[PDB]
Each structure stands twice: as structure tokens, then as C-alpha cells.
Design a protein around this ligand. Structure first.
Ligand SMILES: Nc1nc2c(ncn2[C@@H]2O[C@H](COP(=O)(O)OP(=O)(O)OP(=O)(O)O)[C@@H](O)[C@H]2O)c(=O)[nH]1
Ligand SMILES: Nc1nc2c(ncn2[C@@H]2O[C@H](COP(=O)(O)OP(=O)(O)OP(=O)(O)O)[C@@H](O)[C@H]2O)c(=O)[nH]1
Ligand SMILES: Nc1nc2c(ncn2[C@@H]2O[C@H](COP(=O)(O)OP(=O)(O)OP(=O)(O)O)[C@@H](O)[C@H]2O)c(=O)[nH]1
Ligand SMILES: Nc1nc2c(ncn2[C@@H]2O[C@H](COP(=O)(O)OP(=O)(O)OP(=O)(O)O)[C@@H](O)[C@H]2O)c(=O)[nH]1
Ligand SMILES: Nc1ncnc2c1ncn2[C@H]1C[C@H](O)[C@@H](COP(=O)(O)OP(=O)(O)OP(=O)(O)O)O1
Ligand SMILES: Nc1ncnc2c1ncn2[C@H]1C[C@H](O)[C@@H](COP(=O)(O)OP(=O)(O)OP(=O)(O)O)O1
Ligand SMILES: Nc1ncnc2c1ncn2[C@H]1C[C@H](O)[C@@H](COP(=O)(O)OP(=O)(O)OP(=O)(O)O)O1
Ligand SMILES: Nc1ncnc2c1ncn2[C@H]1C[C@H](O)[C@@H](COP(=O)(O)OP(=O)(O)OP(=O)(O)O)O1
Ligand SMILES: Nc1ccn([C@H]2C[C@H](O)[C@@H](COP(=O)(O)OP(=O)(O)OP(=O)(O)O)O2)c(=O)n1
Ligand SMILES: [Fe+3]
Ligand SMILES: [Fe+3]
Ligand SMILES: [Fe+3]
Ligand SMILES: [Fe+3]
Ligand SMILES: [Mg+2]
Ligand SMILES: [Mg+2]
Ligand SMILES: [Mg+2]
Ligand SMILES: [Mg+2]
Ligand SMILES: [Mg+2]
Ligand SMILES: [Mg+2]
Ligand SMILES: [Mg+2]
Ligand SMILES: [Mg+2]
Lengths: 422, 458, 458, 422
């Protein structure tokens, strides 16, 4: 029957039997062992939470918002079927996350397989489909009044993106396609849950109260179409929310130590590739960078690889183990410097691999006692309204920490940075 | 070279350079991968904190308390070396915890190697010895004014008991320093002041006890011809409320039925997965999970990783553990059959634990049952609840002082405070489960349990 | 049309237009000038809240509770009429409070007028009738589906109680509605759910009780032909916890000794200032401070302002009260001498407080002291701390239900929970204060106190 | 002896015996009956705190800050006398506020006594002088090592304004004058306590953390003047503080209903004056307006006067009694045009009482059969960096509420706006 679950951020959360049956599966339970902040744990010791609670809270918030909108305006004709669909769509919106959350799909894939464009939302939808097919959820959905043929496509459109290109639901229910994921302005339950959880656990003060926003929720006919909006006196609250997210990003998400630790972890993983085998269906052996193509082999791809490399004994993982130990002793790669936003031409996804080669290839005018190779430079790339903006940061890090190497490495930056017109 | 750390519970924790140097070692960083509550993460989804923060907070609290006590009475002759030694003893007091914190030393070792008695304090002592020996910390301790020869022994006696004033670390006029981190005369020490706040913040429960007020009214007097920490006579109710809050937390979170059953299943999986997992230690030797306690190098590589190591294995020999772990994933746990009224006559000893399932299986229900149950499909657990002194009153050993004569020690009995305090301070709970999960088995198990409980007159 | 108001403890409260119409009246707005804790503002500087927000919060809590109960079980036939009646009853339950809240009706009235019985509930009811009759609210109530001839009587009954099945406001199948604003059977309601949070927020003492969880597990079990709100069988510990927290708050903040002595001095100042303050009531009559409880028109002008009216006066007739309040303003308080440990007798009745100073004064100590103390210089205070039902276990009148059959109610004894529960639920306390402030007088008073306590075997 | 006092914001606080002796006097105890927010209580029911705890918190914060600053640099030669003097100054900074603490000196005095300038700092310093003179505290001050003649002057210069005009200390200890009341940019303990207490009570959350600022507090001799030089990485924290201040000011202090009630009660007091009489030294009698010239008469001036007017019985106070009855019945005045913001040109302080007459003198080009005298119109006047901005708003309010008057009142408003070029 109805299941009550505790949550430090929110209160007691009720779970529909369908959601309870969905959670109790290996595919969703796998989220217990993936970290919300990934590499930010080693810089904020008090941040050690996973995606399980994040998904639960996102689903709860989406359900609450949909129920409030439905009750406050009975003529929109929102049925419990839509409520179940939105809740299930908000529960399974992060199933595709790899190890260390954003670090995997942001920094490991491009340096491993440049010819495949992959974002974790496609992984999420594939994992959701595999879960539904394997666990036999469809009969239950039919039992509870949900139509699999339409509902599955509606959920898929809710998770990933697409004169109405959507086919899950008719155009008169447009607002339902923004509650979980909003592609137009960037306001939905998901960012609210990030803000709340990060502020609570990390230890930062907050400014945005989502309940006040929920109170003044109306579905107007703005833009010759149905659309969510905010009351005319909510400008201050909206700008406060924007300032809160910007402050969170600057204070936590872009810390020097977090990014450097992520960089060394990624280097260790890349060097350790082609030696760890994960068995999928039929005994097929996949590598770390090729396991996405098979979901059963991808399920066993969690944060355990870090410890598997760390405690490995075979001589084939010598360098990766060495790099992990370097991380452990708190003797990190030395920070070199930063360059103003690239500006004008933008760095493409598949350009990451070539960047270190160009820096080494640059020949500084001054004389350098020590010659640097293409493996001595690692570069980190960071990407930054009804009331009825982006930049790229590039950082360069050097493995060697000796005085001579830093001075020799510094000359490469000045010569290369000026040459590329940053 | 003084560092800073951020903690959600406390504010900014300040670290002496020697403490920072000690923190960055594998033996200490190993704590990042051990759950505080162990199996409680599978009931309270919001409880996923590690021992790293707990150790940091305990060290900070000990340092702050010793600093405050020294500043209150500048005649005690407290020096920098004393504060540093206290902080170090407070930072390395839980290094001996195995996977899933208390589950290991509470359920596995007594079942895997019943020939010896082992507690995590001894493991902490051995790991501290290994850390100091192998990480080359003695020269730095000498540099920073400490004397390793006596300081190491002082830290050891701080962590563990004395092993006629027996302590050989400090003179007799410094006996108040031995009741800050781990207090043996009573439970008043800076361990609870940390984990109470941490667990209440993470689990989702409020806390009733405040420690800053207690620190504001602390003094050292001459109880029994020795200097020991002394409290104010207007704080007896506060201490009783401290212990009541401890009991409430233990009864609400740490002793949950589902958490206990999950821990039992994990212990069973570990037992069935033993003799097949090999851990490399010193000299290339191979140790098992249970035997790894005999080597520090092999024990260092023992963390929570074993759960996933067994769960995602593919060897034919680890099927018996993978089945149980998958059953955990699918949430097909054991069923709760019933419970017995708490205590009243006698407390069951440890040696009698193994005989409970057979005894309950031997019960004969009056009404014939269409289902026959075996003696191996029953689980019986015993829980002990007390104030930390096994039927004694902990406050009896606390010395109070007045304001007219602050330098005098007095003792306050139980009848001089209130009439609403608990009469007893110890009890036992007995839980009975079953492995079969079909309705007929549940009915038969209920009949068996009721008959057994009525047989011995609980 | 619905108005939204902001309060700190809760979130945002929506007010029905009828509730807003009732609120904006002189009688209700009077509550803005009464302090909830009264004498506790001179010991806890941060407790300066009033009764207005307390009433608002109680109304909100009652509305939410009845809404949830109606939503969960649809076979009860709960309409908006009952919801509005309950909200009005919970919004107008503390209307009759006097200056300094409980101090007035606890000390001044029993002394000023010792020939009549008066509890603030009757005053609140009388203020309710006066408000409704004077402001012409009956037409507005009729406009919104209410029938005043019955809803008014139901609202009256919900506050005080009855004046077989005795009630008359609703039929016999709506009995559960009488256990939401103020419960008489055991004492679980929303009043001791709102002021807990408010007091613990303002004072600074953290709270442990959680009411949302209790609301989430509330049902009606139809116990003994009497539809009653019934909780779940696993919430016994939480109920004992809330009662323990209430006892802790009473022992900590409300029953502080300094606050009690300040209240006693304020009451003495009021008594000595009486017969010299005139308040004009209905028809042009003049009422004293003590007699104002007879004409509500004059009573509406009796607030905390009397303290400052006496304090800043200049009439020589008010020299005594002005002097006493000025001493209150210089912290020249009466001193504290001693405290007889909880008396091991049956009890001391209310009508026997007068003789205590005479008996303590008349005690002849074994030792002889030159200083003599008169019987008018001793102040004796008797304090009561219990669970709120005169040595009866409150949890004995609460009905629980199991998971398998939520429609069946059962009862639980004290032995089936734990052995650590308190043995007794009632006690007494006695404090003695000496008006004289010089050392010899207070020492003599302490000697007299100890000899007197020894005489009566405390 | 030492005294420990429990505060709901800053926690347990320890009080020096001298400060405890200072507290227990009528002059300091009168603060218990003066509300911090004044007339804003009727908008937010949860804001019912006084200035007593505010002053206590300010003193505690000043003591902690000075102690930490002295400890962190043993080369400053900070003595206990400086700490005691700073704490005393911080305990007697809001000692001059009258009823409601901002209505009086902000609006009431200019309307009744436009020929005299009177800020609340003058009241605070005068009351402090009277307190010390009449409570015999000078011997007590000398008992603990404080020189009365110099320390009293130092405290006076601390509360109010004076190549070194300050006389208490030489130029060496110049940084001591920017702790309790800062006038260059506006960072001080008083505003910290304002923000913390107001956010805690009203039910708002703030993003400022003063503990970090205290930790990173240092003094560097900028351009030959010792200042409180903070670090270079807390520009974000300073931005957070300023954002919190702006949000608080735009949310709580500048609420429309708060200001309408403020002006309403101020007019009630003005109509009630000339009939309320207060006694001072020698039996001399004073009114509300002229009480500011008599400290002993001032000490008996608190919010009791509001109820005195409300609960009066003499016929001569009928109008004020009716006005307060309107306040109680929520028969508020009309928000009748919200005159435009500043135009550089700023209204002089002493011309406030003339503006109501100006509006009635306008001649709008609309058919206004009804005649409205100036007596039925009311106006409100509003107001608005070391590392190691003003505008005035005008609002218009109408005593009458009849719809017929609404049309006529608006016509003068627009015409007066045109006439005044606002
Ligand atoms: N089902 C489930 N419960 C969880 C999970 N995580 C935390 N919980 C909590 O743990 C509790 C376990 O309850 P159940 O799984 O129902 O087990 P039980 O209550 O002993 O027996 P049943 O209710 O009959 O299944 C739930 O009430 C949840 O609040 C989870 O992932 N799945
Ligand atoms: N040393 C250390 N710091 C930690 C740890 N966990 C979190 N931190 C925080 O991470 C920050 C990074 O420390 P460092 O590695 O020394 O970085 P850094 O201070 O810029 O480098 P240095 O100036 O050379 O010391 C510290 O200031 C800590 O607050 C830990 O386990 N060890
Ligand atoms: N009526 C009323 N409002 C209060 C009270 N206490 C706080 N408030 C708040 O003060 C606000 C101002 O009240 P009003 O003067 O009625 O202004 P309003 O809310 O715009 O209502 P209208 O003027 O009738 O449109 C309300 O929104 C309430 O939330 C109170 O005791 N009575
Ligand atoms: N002195 C003083 N204490 C206050 C005030 N407000 C709250 N308190 C608290 O109330 C307590 C009263 O203590 P005291 O005034 O010292 O009286 P006492 O404790 O009964 O005995 P003495 O210390 O001899 O005066 C103090 O400890 C404060 O913590 C105040 O305005 N002045
Ligand atoms: N007193 C409590 N305070 C806070 N959280 C609690 C408390 N008791 C349990 N929780 C946690 C445990 C779960 O996460 C959730 C509620 O679970 P709980 O009520 O114990 O259900 P359960 O599965 O043990 O029993 P059942 O299904 O029989 O009601 O909140
Ligand atoms: N402004 C901030 N607000 C909250 N937490 C912060 C802030 N700045 C840093 N932290 C966190 C990060 C770390 O956990 C700890 C302090 O780290 P931080 O000050 O960034 O040190 P650092 O290693 O970058 O530099 P340094 O060695 O110069 O102190 O607190
Ligand atoms: N920024 C804020 N955040 C939260 N509560 C606020 C804020 N500003 C004001 N409040 C308070 C004021 C009221 O108590 C409640 C909301 O009232 P508010 O929306 O200002 O109504 P109002 O009477 O001014 O206008 P209206 O009738 O147009 O809604 O919350
Ligand atoms: N348990 C408590 N927790 C927090 N604050 C408390 C508690 N009890 C009292 N307080 C408040 C009351 C005062 O505001 C302040 C200190 O009071 P308290 O220590 O009781 O002094 P006191 O004057 O009654 O005692 P004494 O003079 O005997 O030391 O703390
Ligand atoms: N039966 C259990 C189960 C788990 N916990 C967890 C909760 C706490 O976070 C942690 C306590 O850590 P410590 O080892 O420092 O405290 P102890 O209880 O082991 O020592 P003490 O004898 O002082 O109580 O153990 C517990 O205390 N007891
Ligand atoms: Fe997400
Ligand atoms: Fe510990
Ligand atoms: Fe009440
Ligand atoms: Fe101030
Ligand atoms: Mg995502
Ligand atoms: Mg550094
Ligand atoms: Mg331990
Ligand atoms: Mg359950
Ligand atoms: Mg409004
Ligand atoms: Mg009452
Ligand atoms: Mg005291
Ligand atoms: Mg000021």
C-alpha cells in the first residue's frame, strides 16, 4: 500500500505503489553508489550524498507541483494518469549518470571516443526502457490505468527533448512538458532540488523558497499558447534565485581543488583502460569506454572502479595505482594559470584531445632548460519569463611540480596563449 | 601553515600542521569509505556520512574543551604539548572500524572466530602504531616540541584503558586529561557531543541536548584526592536529559527492525563468502576477511568495497553470497514474526545465543499446523539497552560543586533531584524472524513463537 | 478573496473571509498587547511573543488536521461547515486571558477575590459572545452557509466543554470533532503542538517533538460507539517523548525561580495598587482591576498597560506599588533561601498555603541567633509538575490500531512498552524566599528553614 | 560576578560586572517597551522584538570582534580598557530612540518642531550622560581601571561624530572608530545584528555569514590610515551581504501598508499632542514634542502613549481616539497615486509640513464638482572598500475613502505631479 519515506530536506514523502515497485530494482538501486558531487567530496568532507535521494525528491516535487496546478484550476482537466506519468518521468531522469556524476560524460568520453556524441539523458532513456522491459512493469502500468503505448512515449519525451513535434500527448497539455525539464528558460523542480540539497549538506546559506513560488502558480495563455508563468511581484524572488545559483556555482562547483582532483582521476581512468573487463550479456567483455553500448554491462559501472584500481595488485595497473596514491597523499598537480574566456570561436567537444599537443608543440622565444613533451600538459575546460549569458573557461595544469618544470611549463603558456588569440 | 576545513555541523575547524601531516596517510584516508551507520543507509535514505568528518569533529571538540578548561583556571599548568596530544588522541580514536562500522565487531567476528575477543579500540591502537612507524612521523613530533617516547604511550592510554594509580603517561596531578575523549568513570566525553549532532542532522530528527552550555559550567575540583572534571549542581536534569536523548536515538534509529535484519543478512552473506576472498598483506601473504585482523597492511585494504566486490563477482564459488545480495536489492527481506516483553527476571548471556533458534523450534503449538518448520529457518536476536554502565547509575560518579564554595566537590543522589526519573537502567529485547516468506510459513512461525514465549513465562 | 498571512513557525496561512472579518475587531486585536510567558521576559530576553499569533497558528493547525482527516477517510461526511466551525473555535480559545497571561488567573484572582471560581476559558467564552453580539457577525455567518443558532453553541462547547452523551453542538456520529482544539480525555491536541514550537523557537531551547509525523498516522477507530481519533500502535514512544518534552519545558523555562519571584512581586504591587485604578465600563460604571471580570466592556480595556500605568504614575496614593516596581527595575529582588526536596507526603491543598509562613516563622531552632525574623518576611511558593491528569497515566486513555486491520482499536499498558518509564506522574515543590537582604537575616532564615524542614520530615 | 545570558541568535553570552551594573537602571530598562520595527508590526505578526536584545547583541558582537582582532595581531598593543570602552559604546548606541524608534525622529518631530534639528544619536548621547551622572557609575568605572574623564569622551565620540579631530585616542589607534558605527561604506556590527535578527524573526533566510568575516579580519595600514583590511577572495561574500541588505529593505522596511499605518499613527499623535502632559524635574510639565528637551521626562516616553491615547476618556482627544479606532478596524487610508521617484532635486527636511498644502492648491483640468481641502490629504516621505546611491520616493494618501473623492483626489495628484515636474 502507500509507503512513507523520510527525507531530511523535505518532510515525509508518500510513494505510489507503482513508484515503489519501480524503485526496488537493480537498475534504480545502482544509484546508491554514485555521488551527487563526484569529485567535490575530497574538497568538502561533509558532502557525501548520492543520486537516490535526488531522484526521489525530484519526483516528489514534480508530483506536488502538478497536483497544485491541477487543483487550483479544475478546468484544465488534469487526470491522475498525467500525475503518474510526470512522477515516473521525474523519478528516472538521472538513471544514465556514470561514475562521479557529471565528470564521466563531461571529461572522460571526449578524451576516449571522440567519434561518438553522448549525453547522459540518452543513457537515462535507454536505461529506463531496459528497466521497463526487463522488470515487467508494463502489466502493472496497465493495471493502474496507464496506457503503455502512449505513456511510455510521453515519459520519454519528458526526459529527453523532441507544428507540435511531440506525439505523446495533444498540444492542449503543453505545460506538462516543462514541469520536469524546461528547455526554454531553465526553471523546474530539478534545479530546486539541487539548490536545496547542496545548500543543506554542503553548509551554504540559501535565499530561495520554492513554496512561495508554488503558491503563485497559474497557467495562462501567454505567447498564444498555454504556459507556466509567475506573478508580477516575483521579480525579486526570481533574481534572488538566479543570484543563489550563481553563488553556488562559483563557490562550490568550480573550485580549484575539485577540478584538479577530477582531472587526475580522469587521467588515471584513461591510463587504466583496456585492462578492466566488465561482462555483459552472452559473456561479451567490454572496456570502460565501450560499456555504454550494453546496458547490463553498464550497470556494473559505478564508483567501485576507483577502488578496484586502487587496491589492484597486477603489474598492468602500475601507473593508475600510482596516480591514485598521489591523489591520496595530497600531492596534486601544480596549478599553472588561467586564461580569460576563449571568446568568439567556441571550443568544440572533440577538440579536447588535440589541445595538450598544441601547447607542447609551441616553441617559446625564451630558452628553456627542460624540454616538455605532449604528456606534460593537462587542460581543463569549463562551460559557463512570463510575469503576468555563457562563456568557456580553460585551465592548464602540469603533472611535474618541480621548480624547473613550472618555469619551463610557464613559457609554453605565454607563447601558446598569445598564438591562439585568447 | 595553519589550515582550515569546512564542516556542516560545526563552523571552521582549525588544524595544526602536524595534524594535517598525520591526516594525509592511507591508514587515515581509509576512513572515507566506511559508512557511519552501516546498514542504516537502507532505511534512512538521508544517512550517508562517513567516519572522516566524525573523527575531525571529535578532535576539534576535544581541543576546544581542553583550551576552555585551561583558560578558565590558569593554575592547572596546561601546555601546548598537552593540547596537541589530546587533539591527536581525539583524531585517531576510531581507526579500527571495519566495513559498515559496528556490524563487523558486533556480529561477524563473534561468529567467524569465536576463540578470541576483539574490539575496535585495540585495532585503533595497532593502526596508530603502524601509522606512526611507517609514515615517519617521529622526527616531526620531535621538531614540534613533543617527546615521542612518552607521548605515544600517553595517546595509547587515552584511546584505550590503563593497559594505586596505573596510568604511566602523566603525573597524578593531571588526571583530568584522561576523561575528555574517552571517559571510563562515566559516559561524559566528547564523542556523544559529536555523533548526537551528526546523526540528528542527517537522519532527520531534532536534538534536545546542548553542549556549549555544559562547557560554560565546567570546572576541575579535588574529588577523592585527585583532579577530575566537575559540574555545577544546577545541571543534573540536563545530564539526565542527555542520557534520555541517547536512549531515544538508540531506540529510534540504531535499533530499527529493518536495519537489523539487513545487517544480519549482510553478515550471513559475508560468512558464506569467506574462505574464497583473498587479501594480500605483508610479504605477499594472503589473508581472508576474518583473519585480516592479524596484519595491518592487509586490514588497511578492508573497507566497504567488499559489498560490491562480492555483489558484482561472476565466479561460481560466490553464488551463495550473490543470491543474498540480490535478494537485498529486490527487497525480499526476512519477515518479522513477533517480539517479547522486555526483561524482568534475567539477562541472557552471550554463550546462549546459538541455542535460541533450536529452543523456539522445539516449541509445540497446541493447534496442529498444516506446515512443518525446520530449526534452521528461524532467526533470534537480542538487544541490550542501558545508560552505558550495565544497570548502574552513571550520574552517581559525577561530582558537582556549588557557587558559594566553587572549590568544593559534592555528590547528589537520585532522590534529591526529581521523582519522575526511571526506576531501572537496563533491559533486554528479543526479536524473532523467519526466512520463508509465504503466508502459511508466517502463520506457522507466529504459532511457534507464541507457544515458545508462553512456555518460559515472559 | 482569501488573505495570506506570514508567520515564522509555520509557512503561509490562508484566511477565509469570515475569519478575516472576525479578526479585525477590537476584542481580538486586544491580544496584541499581552505577552505569552509574562514574567519569563525578565529571565529570557528573547521571549517577547504574544497570544495573537498563537491563536492564528492554532486555528491553522486545527484546519489542516480536520482537512487531512476528512481527505483520508471519505465515509465520515465532513463538510466545509464543520471546517469553518473548527477554525473559528481554534481561533477564539485564548480570548479571555488577562495581563501577563497565566500570572493573572494563577495568582492575582485567587488572592484578590477569594470567593469565586474563575478560569480563563470562561472569560474567553464570554468575550466570544460579547464580540459576536456587538459586532453583528451573525448575518455574515449566515451568508456563508452557517446556521448561527447551532454553530455558535458548537463553538462555545468546543472551548469549555459540556454545560449518556452530553454534547449538543453536533450529532453523536461527529464526536471526533471535539478532540481537535482542546482534548479532555487525555490531552493531545493542537495547542500543545503550536506553543511547543513557538516557545522553543523564541526561548532558544531546541525541541524534539514532531507533529507532522503524528498527523500522517491518524485515523478514527470508532471506540465504544464513540467515534474518536486514534493513533497507530507504533507511536507509543513518540507520545511518551512529547510528554517528557513538555515536562522538560515546564521544569526549565516556565517554572524558573527568578521568574516566579518576579511574578510574585508584580502581583504584590498590583494588589497594593488596587482600589486606586478606575476603568469605565458599559453604562458609565467604574470597575476596579479585580472586579473587571464582571463587565466585559471594561475587561476589554485591561491589558499589560496596567504595569506601565502604575509604574509612571505620580499620585502619592500609589507610592507603594510604584516603589515595588522601581525595585523590580533595579534588580533588588527577594533572595532565595532553600528548597525542601520533593515532599514525601500525600499533598498540600490549595487552601492551606496561608499557614506556611506562620509555621516556618514559629519554628524554634536548636541553636540561638540574635537576629529575629517576623512571619511577614517569608514567602513560600508551591509548584506542581505532573503529566496534566492528576497522577493518571495519559497514554492509558489513547486507542491504537494495527496495520492488518486499521478499523480495529486496541489498548496498550505501560509494561508492554519498556521498563524505563517513570514510576510516578505527580509530585510537588516548595521554595522559600526571604525579604531581608542583609547577610545576618538571610543566614537566620536559612537556619529557620532547615529546622522547619527537619521538623516536618522532608 | 560573571553573568551568562541566553540569546536566541548569538547563543550564550558572558557579561562583565560593569556592564551588568550599567544594565540595571531605569534609563536602560525603558528600552524593553520600544519596538524595533515600529509600525511594521501590524503587517508581519512575527516581528515583535524590542531594542533591548538588539543592544545586547550589538555589544556582544563588538566585544568579540575587538577581542579577535587584538588576539590575531599581538603587535597592536590592545588593552582590556579598549575592549571595555568599545563594549560600553556598543551597549549605548540606540539609547535615544523614542516610540517605534523610527516614526519619532523620522516623521513626527519635523511636522511639530520644524525649526530644530534632532537626530536619535543626540538623544542617545544625552541619555548616556544622564545615566552615568545620576546612577553614580563613575567610581565603579574607576574601580575596574577605566579613566572616567577620557573614557567617557571616547565613548561619546564613538556614538556620534567628532587632521585628527578625535580626542579620545591618538591617531595610532584610529581603527577603533569603525567597529560600532561605520559611516564610510556601512559595515559594522549594528547592521549585522539588524539583518540576522530581522531575517530570523520575519521568516526569511539570508546568505551572509559574519563568522567568516571575523575569521578573516585583519588591519593593514592603507595609505597611512589603519583600516579593517579583509582578504581578496570574499568579494562574493560582500556581494552576498549587500544583496541581503537590498532584499531586506525592498521586502520588509518599504512595505506600503507599513508606511501608510506609520503616517496614520503619526497624524494621530500630532492631533493628540497639546493635550498629553508629562512631568520632569522640579514638577515642570512637558508635552510630547517638547519632552526631547528634558531627559527625565523623556525616560517616561515609550509606546505606552499609544494605548494612553486609545484608552483615554477626556473629550479633548476624540479625534485621535477615532483615528486609532480606524487603525484597529482596518479602515485604512487610500493609496492614491504613488508619486514618481527622485528627480535629482531633493526636498528639504524642514519643508515636509508644507507639501500637503501644495497639493490642495493644484487646479486640474477635469470637472471636479466636489471640493477637497488640504486637511483631507496626507503625504509620505521615503528614503533610499579596502582589500588586502541615494534617491527619495514620494507617496500620496487620502484621508477620505469615498469613491467620489477617489476621482477628485487623483486629478489633483496628476496635476500636482505636472506642477512639480515629478
Ligand atoms: N521499499 C523501500 N523502502 C525503503 C527504501 N529506502 C528506504 N526505505 C524505507 O524503509 C522502510 C522499509 O519498509 P518495507 O520495505 O515495506 O518493509 P517492512 O515495512 O518491514 O514490511 P512491508 O511494509 O510489508 O513491506 C520503508 O517504509 C521506507 O520508508 C527503498 O529503497 N525501498
Ligand atoms: N589537507 C587536506 N585538505 C582537505 C582535506 N579534505 C578537504 N580539504 C580541504 O581542501 C583544501 C585543499 O588543500 P590543499 O591540498 O593543501 O590545497 P592548497 O591549500 O591550495 O595547497 P597548499 O597551499 O600548497 O597547501 C584545504 O584547505 C581543506 O580545507 C583533506 O583530507 N586533507
Ligand atoms: N486584515 C488584517 N491583515 C493583517 C493582519 N496582520 C497582518 N496582516 C497582513 O497585512 C496585509 C495588509 O492588509 P490590508 O490592509 O487588508 O491590505 P490588503 O492585504 O491588500 O487587503 P485589501 O486592502 O482589502 O485589498 C494583509 O495582506 C495581511 O496578510 C491583521 O491582523 N488583519
Ligand atoms: N542581571 C541581569 N540578569 C538578567 C537580565 N535579563 C535576564 N537575566 C538573567 O537572569 C539571571 C538572574 O540572575 P541574578 O540577577 O544574578 O540573580 P540570582 O541568580 O538569583 O542571584 P545573584 O547572582 O546574587 O543576583 C541572570 O543570570 C541572567 O542570565 C538582566 O536584564 N539583568
Ligand atoms: N520516529 C521517526 N522519526 C523519523 N524518521 C523515522 C522515524 N521512524 C521511522 N523513520 C524513518 C524510517 C523510514 O525511512 C520512514 C518511516 O518508516 P517506518 O515508519 O519505520 O516504517 P516501517 O517500514 O518500519 O514500518 P511499517 O510499514 O510497519 O509502518 O522514516
Ligand atoms: N566562501 C566560502 N564559503 C563556504 N565554503 C567555502 C568558501 N571558500 C572555501 N570554502 C570551503 C572550501 C574548503 O572546504 C574550505 C576552505 O577552502 P579554501 O578556502 O577554498 O582553500 P584553498 O585550498 O582554496 O586555499 P588556501 O590554501 O589559500 O586556504 O571551505
Ligand atoms: N519577500 C517576501 N517573502 C515572504 N513574505 C513576504 C515578503 N514580503 C512580504 N511578505 C509577507 C507580507 C504578508 O505577510 C505576506 C504576503 O503579503 P503581500 O503579498 O505583501 O500582500 P499585500 O496585502 O501587500 O498585497 P496583495 O493584496 O496585492 O497581495 O508575506
Ligand atoms: N536549560 C537552559 N538552557 C538554556 N538557557 C537556559 C537554561 N536554563 C536557563 N537558561 C537561561 C536563563 C538565563 O537567561 C540564562 C542563565 O540562567 P541561569 O544559569 O539559570 O541563572 P540563574 O540566575 O538562575 O542561576 P545562578 O545565579 O544560580 O547561577 O540562561
Ligand atoms: N548499536 C549501534 C549501532 C551503530 N551506532 C553508531 C552510531 C554512532 O554514529 C556511532 C558511535 O561511534 P563511536 O564508536 O565513537 O561511539 P560508541 O557508541 O561506539 O562509543 P561509546 O562507548 O562512547 O558509546 O555508532 C551505535 O552507536 N550503536
Ligand atoms: Fe537530476
Ligand atoms: Fe568515535
Ligand atoms: Fe492556547
Ligand atoms: Fe542599532
Ligand atoms: Mg541531470
Ligand atoms: Mg594552500
Ligand atoms: Mg569507537
Ligand atoms: Mg514497515
Ligand atoms: Mg493585500
Ligand atoms: Mg487556555
Ligand atoms: Mg544566576
Ligand atoms: Mg541608531
Amino acid at each position: 500500500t502507500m509507503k512513507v519515506i523520510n527525507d531530511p530536506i523535505h518532510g515525509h514523502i508518500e510513494l505510489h505503489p507503482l513508484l515503489v515497485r519501480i524503485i526496488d530494482t537493480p537498475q534504480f538501486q545502482r544509484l546508491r553508489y554514485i555521488k551527487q558531487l563526484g569529485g567535490g567530496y575530497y574538497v568538502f568532507p561533509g558532502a557525501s550524498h548520492n543520486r537516490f535521494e535526488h531522484s526521489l525528491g525530484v519526483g516528489y516535487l514534480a508530483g506536488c507541483l502538478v497536483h497544485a496546478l491541477g487543483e487550483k484550476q479544475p478546468e484544465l482537466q488534469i487526470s491522475e494518469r498525467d500525475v503518474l506519468c510526470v512522477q515516473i518521468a521525474g523519478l528516472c531522469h538521472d538513471l544514465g549518470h556514470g561514475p562521479f556524476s557529471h565528470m564521466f560524460d563531461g571529461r572522460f568520453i571526449p578524451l576516449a571516443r571522440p567519434e561518438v556524441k553522448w549525453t547522459h539523458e540518452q543513457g537515462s532513456v535507454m536505461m529506463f526502457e531496459h528497466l521497463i522491459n526487463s522488470n515487467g512493469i508494463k502489466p502493472v502500468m496497465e493495471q493502474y490505468g496507464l496506457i503503455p503505448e502512449e505513456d511510455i512515449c510521453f515519459i520519454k519525451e519528458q526526459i529527453v527533448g523532441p507544428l507540435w513535434p511531440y506525439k505523446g500527448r495533444p498540444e492542449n497539455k503543453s505545460f506538462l512538458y516543462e514541469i520536469v525539464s524546461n528547455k526554454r528558460n531553465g526553471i523546474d523542480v530539478d534545479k530546486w532540488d539541487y539548490f536545496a540539497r547542496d545548500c543543506h549538506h554542503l553548509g551554504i546559506q540559501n535565499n530561495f523558497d520554492y513554496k512561495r513560488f508554488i503558491k503563485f502558480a497559474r497557467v495562462c495563455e501567454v505567447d498564444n499558447e498555454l504556459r507556466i508563468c509567475a506573478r508580477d511581484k516575483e521579480v525579486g524572488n526570481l533574481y534572488d534565485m538566479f543570484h543563489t545559483r550563481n553563488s553556488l556555482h562559483r563557490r562550490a562547483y568550480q573550485h580549484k581543488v575539485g577540478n584538479i582532483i577530477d582531472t587526475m582521476i580522469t587521467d588515471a581512468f584513461l591510463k587504466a583502460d583496456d585492462y578492466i573487463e566488465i561482462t555483459g550479456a552472452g559473456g561479451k567483455k567490454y572496456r570502460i569506454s565501450t560499456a555504454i553500448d550494453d546496458m547490463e554491462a553498464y550497470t556494473k559501472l559505478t564508483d567501485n572502479i576507483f577502488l578496484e584500481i586502487l587496491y589492484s595488485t597486477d603489474p598492468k595497473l602500475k601507473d593508475a595505482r600510482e596516480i591514485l596514491k598521489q591523489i591520496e597523499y595530497r600531492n596534486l598537480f601544480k596549478y599553472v594559470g588561467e586564461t580569460q574566456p576563449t571568446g568568439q570561436i567556441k571550443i568544440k567537444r572533440e577538440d579536447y584531445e588535440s589541445l595538450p599537443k598544441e601547447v607542447a608543440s609551441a616553441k617559446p622565444k625564451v630558452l628553456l632548460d627542460v624540454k616538455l613533451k605532449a604528456e606534460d600538459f593537462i587542460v581543463d575546460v569549463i562551460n559557463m519569463v512570463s510575469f503576468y549569458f555563457a562563456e568557456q573557461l580553460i585551465r592548464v595544469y602540469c603533472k611535474k611540480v618541480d621548480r624547473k618544470s613550472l618555469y619551463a611549463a610557464r613559457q609554453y603558456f605565454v607563447q601558446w596563449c598569445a598564438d591562439r588569440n585568447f
